[PDB]
DNA sequence: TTTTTTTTTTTT
DNA sequence: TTTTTTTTTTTT
């Protein structure tokens, strides 16, 4: 357990796992923050970012948050349990 | 404005804009639902799904849902307003 | 008979029957051509692609072409007429 | 080199490679011969047949041979060099 | 739970 | 070369 904190990748950046091979993480690049949702692969004893994924600006991410309730309603309509 | 609503493409699939050319959409492939967050591009007067993006299974989407408070908290720590 | 010809499905894609419910077809996916050798099944009065089968890239198909004489020779050795 | 012969899998059956992970091979099962075109995977120091693939009867295979000239013409029409 | 590969591999 | 996963994994 580790309440409050998180995992950190080899670049020093926090990430949360969404599958065994997929991460959401926050990275700073050219002085802006990006919310990266990406596939990772293992090579040379290290986990590296793969080419399948996307990096959202904070505004893009904020717009994504705004859509979540509607997205959830659609998924439930299709028979999934979203809470 | 259209709060709580959505858009639908010609394929009948729902989507929500998160930027000028980026969408998060839901569609069915191999009888599974996928939540795609993806860049779109123009071609022949049509917007088409591009190479940059990712398609989440429902389980992966819900895992992402669980991480949101911690993501939000980190962003606020880096000085953004969520 | 239709020697040298083919069939076409509603999608506009060519195919050749190799049994009552098996086909080898050609179609485009991700802007590549695939040669699928695959079992088909009925649904709503339509024949649909099933789970059993395989889709070869063109390179894989040509590799298979190269193996044919050796495959044929083995089958003849097992008593079949090719 | 090995002119005349072939590779043989752990079950004693001849096979020819069509990609790094895909084989065509001939197997006898319930006293009939099958031409198997299949994905293989590595597990426990052995290559095993995967679930993506298909096993043709000799008649099915023979019917496939009959289609080859037309298949080739179609591929060339789509810009590929088949010889 | 009935189609479609391999190689390479972040960030508006 | 502009969408869609993971787990398990032969043979009419």
CSV table of C-alpha atoms (C1' of nucleotides) in Angstrom, one decimal:
chain,number,residue,atom,x,y,z
A,1,UNK,CA,0.0,0.0,0.0
A,2,UNK,CA,0.9,3.7,-0.5
A,3,UNK,CA,-1.9,6.1,0.4
A,4,UNK,CA,-1.4,9.7,-0.9
A,5,UNK,CA,1.4,8.9,-3.3
A,6,UNK,CA,1.8,7.0,-6.6
A,7,UNK,CA,4.1,5.1,-8.9
A,8,UNK,CA,6.7,7.0,-10.8
A,9,UNK,CA,8.3,6.1,-14.1
A,10,UNK,CA,12.1,6.2,-14.9
A,11,UNK,CA,11.7,9.8,-16.0
A,12,UNK,CA,10.4,10.9,-12.6
A,13,UNK,CA,6.8,11.2,-13.8
A,14,UNK,CA,3.7,9.9,-11.9
A,15,UNK,CA,1.5,7.4,-13.6
A,16,UNK,CA,-1.5,5.2,-13.0
A,17,UNK,CA,-2.0,1.8,-14.6
A,18,UNK,CA,-5.1,1.1,-16.7
A,19,UNK,CA,-4.1,-2.3,-18.0
A,20,UNK,CA,-0.9,-4.4,-17.6
A,21,UNK,CA,0.5,-2.6,-20.6
A,22,UNK,CA,-1.2,0.8,-20.6
A,23,UNK,CA,-0.7,3.9,-18.4
A,24,UNK,CA,-2.2,7.3,-17.8
A,25,UNK,CA,0.5,9.7,-16.6
A,26,UNK,CA,1.4,13.3,-16.4
A,27,UNK,CA,4.5,14.7,-18.1
A,28,UNK,CA,6.0,18.2,-18.6
A,29,UNK,CA,7.3,18.8,-22.1
A,30,UNK,CA,8.4,22.2,-23.5
A,31,UNK,CA,7.1,23.7,-20.3
A,32,UNK,CA,3.6,22.5,-20.7
A,33,UNK,CA,1.9,19.6,-18.9
A,34,UNK,CA,0.4,16.7,-20.8
A,35,UNK,CA,-1.9,13.9,-19.7
A,36,UNK,CA,-0.6,10.9,-21.6
A,37,UNK,CA,-2.7,7.8,-22.2
A,38,UNK,CA,-0.3,5.3,-23.8
A,39,UNK,CA,0.8,1.8,-24.5
A,40,UNK,CA,4.2,0.9,-22.9
A,41,UNK,CA,6.6,-1.8,-23.8
A,42,UNK,CA,9.5,-3.5,-22.1
A,43,UNK,CA,13.0,-3.2,-23.6
A,44,UNK,CA,16.4,-3.3,-22.0
A,45,UNK,CA,15.1,-3.7,-18.4
A,46,UNK,CA,13.0,-0.5,-18.8
A,47,UNK,CA,9.4,0.3,-19.7
A,48,UNK,CA,9.3,2.7,-22.6
A,49,UNK,CA,6.4,4.7,-24.2
A,50,UNK,CA,5.0,3.0,-27.3
A,51,UNK,CA,3.5,4.6,-30.4
A,52,UNK,CA,-0.1,3.8,-29.6
A,53,UNK,CA,-1.5,6.5,-27.4
A,54,UNK,CA,-2.2,10.2,-27.1
A,55,UNK,CA,-1.1,13.2,-25.2
A,56,UNK,CA,-3.8,15.6,-24.0
A,57,UNK,CA,-3.2,19.3,-23.2
A,58,UNK,CA,-4.8,20.3,-19.8
A,59,UNK,CA,-7.6,22.0,-21.7
A,60,UNK,CA,-8.2,18.8,-23.8
A,61,UNK,CA,-8.2,16.8,-20.6
A,62,UNK,CA,-10.6,19.3,-19.0
A,63,UNK,CA,-12.9,19.0,-22.1
A,64,UNK,CA,-12.7,15.2,-21.6
A,65,UNK,CA,-13.9,15.5,-18.0
A,66,UNK,CA,-16.9,17.5,-19.2
A,67,UNK,CA,-17.9,14.6,-21.5
A,68,UNK,CA,-17.6,11.8,-18.9
A,69,UNK,CA,-21.3,11.9,-17.6
A,70,UNK,CA,-22.6,11.5,-21.2
A,71,UNK,CA,-20.0,8.8,-22.1
A,72,UNK,CA,-21.1,6.9,-19.0
A,73,UNK,CA,-24.7,7.1,-19.9
A,74,UNK,CA,-24.0,5.7,-23.3
A,75,UNK,CA,-21.9,2.8,-21.9
A,76,UNK,CA,-24.7,1.9,-19.5
A,77,UNK,CA,-27.2,2.0,-22.4
A,78,UNK,CA,-24.9,-0.6,-24.0
A,79,UNK,CA,-25.1,-2.8,-20.9
A,80,UNK,CA,-22.0,-1.9,-18.9
A,81,UNK,CA,-21.8,-1.1,-15.2
A,82,UNK,CA,-20.3,2.4,-14.8
A,83,UNK,CA,-20.4,3.9,-11.3
B,1,UNK,CA,-24.6,24.8,-26.2
B,2,UNK,CA,-25.6,21.1,-25.9
B,3,UNK,CA,-24.8,20.1,-22.3
B,4,UNK,CA,-25.4,16.3,-21.6
B,5,UNK,CA,-25.8,15.7,-25.3
B,6,UNK,CA,-23.4,14.5,-27.9
B,7,UNK,CA,-22.6,14.4,-31.6
B,8,UNK,CA,-23.1,11.5,-33.9
B,9,UNK,CA,-21.1,10.7,-37.0
B,10,UNK,CA,-22.4,9.2,-40.3
B,11,UNK,CA,-21.6,5.7,-39.0
B,12,UNK,CA,-24.2,6.3,-36.2
B,13,UNK,CA,-21.5,6.4,-33.5
B,14,UNK,CA,-21.6,9.0,-30.7
B,15,UNK,CA,-18.7,11.4,-30.0
B,16,UNK,CA,-17.7,14.5,-28.0
B,17,UNK,CA,-15.2,17.1,-29.1
B,18,UNK,CA,-12.2,17.8,-26.8
B,19,UNK,CA,-10.5,20.1,-29.3
B,20,UNK,CA,-10.8,21.4,-32.9
B,21,UNK,CA,-9.6,18.0,-34.3
B,22,UNK,CA,-9.7,15.7,-31.3
B,23,UNK,CA,-12.6,13.5,-30.3
B,24,UNK,CA,-13.5,10.9,-27.7
B,25,UNK,CA,-15.9,8.4,-29.2
B,26,UNK,CA,-17.7,5.1,-28.6
B,27,UNK,CA,-18.0,2.4,-31.2
B,28,UNK,CA,-18.4,-1.4,-31.5
B,29,UNK,CA,-15.6,-3.6,-32.9
B,30,UNK,CA,-15.5,-7.5,-32.6
B,31,UNK,CA,-18.7,-7.1,-30.5
B,32,UNK,CA,-16.9,-5.1,-27.8
B,33,UNK,CA,-17.3,-1.4,-27.0
B,34,UNK,CA,-14.3,0.8,-27.3
B,35,UNK,CA,-13.8,4.4,-26.0
B,36,UNK,CA,-11.4,6.0,-28.6
B,37,UNK,CA,-9.6,9.3,-27.8
B,38,UNK,CA,-8.2,10.1,-31.1
B,39,UNK,CA,-7.0,12.8,-33.6
B,40,UNK,CA,-9.2,13.3,-36.7
B,41,UNK,CA,-8.2,14.6,-40.1
B,42,UNK,CA,-9.9,15.8,-43.3
B,43,UNK,CA,-10.2,13.9,-46.5
B,44,UNK,CA,-12.7,14.5,-49.4
B,45,UNK,CA,-14.8,16.8,-47.1
B,46,UNK,CA,-15.0,14.1,-44.5
B,47,UNK,CA,-13.5,13.8,-41.0
B,48,UNK,CA,-11.7,10.5,-40.6
B,49,UNK,CA,-10.0,8.7,-37.6
B,50,UNK,CA,-6.3,9.2,-37.6
B,51,UNK,CA,-3.2,7.3,-36.5
B,52,UNK,CA,-2.6,9.2,-33.2
B,53,UNK,CA,-4.8,8.1,-30.4
B,54,UNK,CA,-5.9,5.1,-28.4
B,55,UNK,CA,-8.9,2.8,-28.0
B,56,UNK,CA,-9.7,1.8,-24.5
B,57,UNK,CA,-11.8,-1.2,-23.5
B,58,UNK,CA,-14.5,-0.5,-21.0
B,59,UNK,CA,-12.4,-2.0,-18.1
B,60,UNK,CA,-9.6,0.3,-19.1
B,61,UNK,CA,-11.9,3.3,-19.3
B,62,UNK,CA,-13.2,2.6,-15.8
B,63,UNK,CA,-9.6,2.2,-14.5
B,64,UNK,CA,-8.9,5.7,-15.9
B,65,UNK,CA,-12.1,6.9,-14.1
B,66,UNK,CA,-10.6,5.7,-10.8
B,67,UNK,CA,-7.3,7.6,-11.4
B,68,UNK,CA,-9.0,10.9,-12.1
B,69,UNK,CA,-8.9,12.3,-8.6
B,70,UNK,CA,-5.2,11.6,-8.3
B,71,UNK,CA,-4.6,13.0,-11.8
B,72,UNK,CA,-6.6,16.1,-10.9
B,73,UNK,CA,-4.7,16.5,-7.6
B,74,UNK,CA,-1.4,16.3,-9.4
B,75,UNK,CA,-2.4,18.9,-12.0
B,76,UNK,CA,-3.6,21.2,-9.3
B,77,UNK,CA,-0.2,20.8,-7.6
B,78,UNK,CA,1.4,21.9,-10.9
B,79,UNK,CA,-0.8,25.0,-10.8
B,80,UNK,CA,-3.8,24.2,-13.0
B,81,UNK,CA,-7.5,24.7,-12.1
B,82,UNK,CA,-9.7,21.6,-12.3
C,1,UNK,CA,-18.7,-23.5,-64.3
C,2,UNK,CA,-16.8,-20.2,-64.0
C,3,UNK,CA,-13.1,-21.0,-64.6
C,4,UNK,CA,-10.8,-18.0,-64.1
C,5,UNK,CA,-13.7,-16.0,-62.6
C,6,UNK,CA,-14.6,-15.4,-59.0
C,7,UNK,CA,-17.5,-14.5,-56.8
C,8,UNK,CA,-18.0,-11.1,-55.1
C,9,UNK,CA,-19.8,-10.4,-51.8
C,10,UNK,CA,-22.1,-7.5,-51.0
C,11,UNK,CA,-19.0,-5.6,-49.7
C,12,UNK,CA,-17.6,-5.7,-53.3
C,13,UNK,CA,-14.8,-8.1,-52.3
C,14,UNK,CA,-13.7,-11.0,-54.4
C,15,UNK,CA,-13.8,-14.7,-53.2
C,16,UNK,CA,-13.5,-18.3,-54.3
C,17,UNK,CA,-15.2,-21.3,-52.6
C,18,UNK,CA,-13.0,-24.1,-51.4
C,19,UNK,CA,-15.8,-25.9,-49.6
C,20,UNK,CA,-19.5,-25.5,-48.8
C,21,UNK,CA,-18.7,-23.0,-46.0
C,22,UNK,CA,-15.0,-22.1,-46.6
C,23,UNK,CA,-13.7,-19.3,-48.7
C,24,UNK,CA,-10.4,-17.7,-49.6
C,25,UNK,CA,-11.0,-14.0,-50.2
C,26,UNK,CA,-9.2,-10.7,-50.8
C,27,UNK,CA,-10.0,-7.5,-48.9
C,28,UNK,CA,-8.4,-4.2,-47.8
C,29,UNK,CA,-7.8,-3.4,-44.2
C,30,UNK,CA,-5.6,-0.5,-42.9
C,31,UNK,CA,-4.8,0.2,-46.5
C,32,UNK,CA,-3.2,-3.3,-46.9
C,33,UNK,CA,-4.4,-6.3,-48.9
C,34,UNK,CA,-5.2,-9.5,-47.0
C,35,UNK,CA,-5.8,-13.0,-48.3
C,36,UNK,CA,-8.2,-14.6,-45.9
C,37,UNK,CA,-8.8,-18.3,-45.9
C,38,UNK,CA,-11.7,-18.6,-43.5
C,39,UNK,CA,-14.8,-20.4,-42.4
C,40,UNK,CA,-18.2,-18.7,-43.0
C,41,UNK,CA,-21.5,-19.0,-41.1
C,42,UNK,CA,-25.1,-18.0,-41.6
C,43,UNK,CA,-26.9,-15.2,-39.8
C,44,UNK,CA,-30.1,-13.4,-40.8
C,45,UNK,CA,-29.9,-14.9,-44.3
C,46,UNK,CA,-26.4,-13.6,-44.7
C,47,UNK,CA,-23.0,-15.4,-44.8
C,48,UNK,CA,-20.6,-13.8,-42.4
C,49,UNK,CA,-16.8,-14.3,-41.7
C,50,UNK,CA,-16.2,-16.6,-38.7
C,51,UNK,CA,-13.6,-17.0,-36.0
C,52,UNK,CA,-11.8,-20.0,-37.6
C,53,UNK,CA,-9.4,-19.0,-40.3
C,54,UNK,CA,-6.4,-16.7,-41.0
C,55,UNK,CA,-5.6,-13.5,-42.9
C,56,UNK,CA,-2.3,-13.5,-44.8
C,57,UNK,CA,-0.4,-10.4,-45.9
C,58,UNK,CA,0.7,-10.5,-49.5
C,59,UNK,CA,4.3,-11.4,-48.5
C,60,UNK,CA,2.9,-14.3,-46.5
C,61,UNK,CA,0.8,-15.4,-49.4
C,62,UNK,CA,3.8,-15.4,-51.7
C,63,UNK,CA,5.8,-17.3,-49.1
C,64,UNK,CA,3.0,-19.9,-49.2
C,65,UNK,CA,3.2,-19.9,-53.0
C,66,UNK,CA,6.9,-20.8,-52.8
C,67,UNK,CA,6.2,-23.8,-50.5
C,68,UNK,CA,3.5,-25.4,-52.7
C,69,UNK,CA,5.7,-27.7,-54.7
C,70,UNK,CA,7.2,-29.1,-51.4
C,71,UNK,CA,3.7,-29.4,-49.9
C,72,UNK,CA,2.4,-31.1,-53.0
C,73,UNK,CA,5.4,-33.5,-53.0
C,74,UNK,CA,4.7,-34.4,-49.4
C,75,UNK,CA,1.0,-35.0,-50.0
C,76,UNK,CA,1.8,-37.2,-53.0
C,77,UNK,CA,4.2,-39.1,-50.8
C,78,UNK,CA,1.3,-39.7,-48.4
C,79,UNK,CA,-0.7,-41.1,-51.3
C,80,UNK,CA,-2.8,-38.1,-52.6
C,81,UNK,CA,-3.1,-37.0,-56.2
C,82,UNK,CA,-2.2,-33.4,-56.9
D,1,UNK,CA,21.2,-25.5,-46.7
D,2,UNK,CA,19.1,-28.7,-47.0
D,3,UNK,CA,17.9,-29.5,-50.6
D,4,UNK,CA,15.2,-32.1,-50.9
D,5,UNK,CA,14.2,-32.1,-47.2
D,6,UNK,CA,12.5,-29.7,-44.8
D,7,UNK,CA,12.1,-28.5,-41.2
D,8,UNK,CA,10.1,-30.8,-38.8
D,9,UNK,CA,8.2,-29.7,-35.7
D,10,UNK,CA,8.3,-31.4,-32.3
D,11,UNK,CA,5.4,-33.7,-33.4
D,12,UNK,CA,7.4,-35.0,-36.3
D,13,UNK,CA,5.5,-33.1,-38.9
D,14,UNK,CA,7.0,-31.1,-41.8
D,15,UNK,CA,6.4,-27.4,-42.1
D,16,UNK,CA,7.4,-24.4,-44.1
D,17,UNK,CA,7.7,-20.9,-42.6
D,18,UNK,CA,5.6,-18.0,-44.0
D,19,UNK,CA,6.4,-15.4,-41.5
D,20,UNK,CA,8.5,-15.5,-38.3
D,21,UNK,CA,5.4,-16.6,-36.4
D,22,UNK,CA,3.4,-18.4,-39.1
D,23,UNK,CA,3.8,-21.9,-40.6
D,24,UNK,CA,2.2,-24.0,-43.3
D,25,UNK,CA,2.5,-27.7,-42.4
D,26,UNK,CA,1.1,-31.1,-43.0
D,27,UNK,CA,-0.3,-33.1,-40.2
D,28,UNK,CA,-2.2,-36.5,-40.0
D,29,UNK,CA,-5.1,-36.4,-37.5
D,30,UNK,CA,-7.8,-39.1,-37.1
D,31,UNK,CA,-6.2,-40.8,-40.2
D,32,UNK,CA,-6.6,-37.9,-42.5
D,33,UNK,CA,-4.1,-35.4,-43.7
D,34,UNK,CA,-4.6,-31.7,-43.1
D,35,UNK,CA,-2.8,-28.7,-44.5
D,36,UNK,CA,-2.5,-26.4,-41.6
D,37,UNK,CA,-1.9,-22.6,-42.0
D,38,UNK,CA,-1.4,-21.3,-38.5
D,39,UNK,CA,0.1,-18.9,-36.0
D,40,UNK,CA,2.6,-20.5,-33.6
D,41,UNK,CA,3.7,-19.2,-30.2
D,42,UNK,CA,6.7,-20.0,-28.0
D,43,UNK,CA,6.0,-21.4,-24.5
D,44,UNK,CA,8.2,-23.6,-22.3
D,45,UNK,CA,11.1,-23.9,-24.8
D,46,UNK,CA,8.7,-25.2,-27.5
D,47,UNK,CA,6.7,-23.7,-30.4
D,48,UNK,CA,3.0,-24.5,-30.1
D,49,UNK,CA,0.1,-24.1,-32.5
D,50,UNK,CA,-1.9,-21.0,-31.8
D,51,UNK,CA,-5.6,-20.4,-32.2
D,52,UNK,CA,-5.4,-18.2,-35.3
D,53,UNK,CA,-5.3,-20.5,-38.3
D,54,UNK,CA,-7.1,-23.1,-40.3
D,55,UNK,CA,-6.7,-26.7,-41.2
D,56,UNK,CA,-7.6,-27.6,-44.8
D,57,UNK,CA,-8.6,-31.1,-46.0
D,58,UNK,CA,-6.7,-32.2,-49.1
D,59,UNK,CA,-9.8,-31.4,-51.2
D,60,UNK,CA,-10.1,-28.0,-49.7
D,61,UNK,CA,-6.4,-27.4,-50.4
D,62,UNK,CA,-6.8,-28.7,-53.9
D,63,UNK,CA,-9.7,-26.3,-54.4
D,64,UNK,CA,-7.4,-23.6,-53.1
D,65,UNK,CA,-4.8,-24.4,-55.8
D,66,UNK,CA,-7.5,-24.1,-58.4
D,67,UNK,CA,-8.1,-20.5,-57.3
D,68,UNK,CA,-4.5,-19.3,-57.2
D,69,UNK,CA,-4.3,-18.0,-60.8
D,70,UNK,CA,-7.4,-15.8,-60.2
D,71,UNK,CA,-6.2,-14.7,-56.8
D,72,UNK,CA,-2.8,-13.7,-58.4
D,73,UNK,CA,-4.5,-11.7,-61.1
D,74,UNK,CA,-6.5,-9.8,-58.5
D,75,UNK,CA,-3.4,-9.0,-56.4
D,76,UNK,CA,-1.5,-7.7,-59.4
D,77,UNK,CA,-4.5,-5.6,-60.3
D,78,UNK,CA,-4.0,-4.0,-56.8
D,79,UNK,CA,-0.4,-3.3,-57.6
D,80,UNK,CA,1.5,-6.3,-56.2
D,81,UNK,CA,4.2,-8.3,-57.9
D,82,UNK,CA,3.1,-11.9,-57.9
D,83,UNK,CA,5.2,-14.3,-60.1
E,1,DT,C1',-17.8,-12.9,-26.9
E,2,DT,C1',-17.6,-15.6,-35.2
E,3,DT,C1',-12.1,-11.6,-40.9
E,4,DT,C1',-7.8,-8.6,-41.9
E,5,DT,C1',0.2,-8.4,-40.0
E,6,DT,C1',4.8,-6.9,-38.7
E,7,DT,C1',7.8,-3.6,-37.1
E,8,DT,C1',8.7,0.1,-34.3
E,9,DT,C1',7.6,2.4,-30.4
E,10,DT,C1',5.4,10.0,-25.9
E,11,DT,C1',4.0,14.7,-25.0
E,12,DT,C1',-0.6,20.8,-28.4
F,1,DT,C1',1.3,3.1,-45.3
F,2,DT,C1',-4.1,7.9,-40.6
F,3,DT,C1',-9.7,3.9,-35.0
F,4,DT,C1',-11.1,-0.2,-32.0
F,5,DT,C1',-7.8,-5.2,-26.2
F,6,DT,C1',-6.5,-9.1,-23.6
F,7,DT,C1',-6.1,-13.8,-22.8
F,8,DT,C1',-5.5,-18.1,-24.6
F,9,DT,C1',-3.7,-20.8,-28.0
F,10,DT,C1',-4.3,-27.2,-34.4
F,11,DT,C1',-6.2,-30.5,-37.6
F,12,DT,C1',-13.2,-31.8,-42.0
